[PDB]
Amino acid sequence: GEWAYNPATGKFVWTE
Secondary structure (H helix, E strand, O other): OOOOEEOOOOEEOOOO
């Protein structure tokens, strides 16, 4: 999707 990175922790949402 258009959101695959979490700037709230620095982790990449590899789960999606």
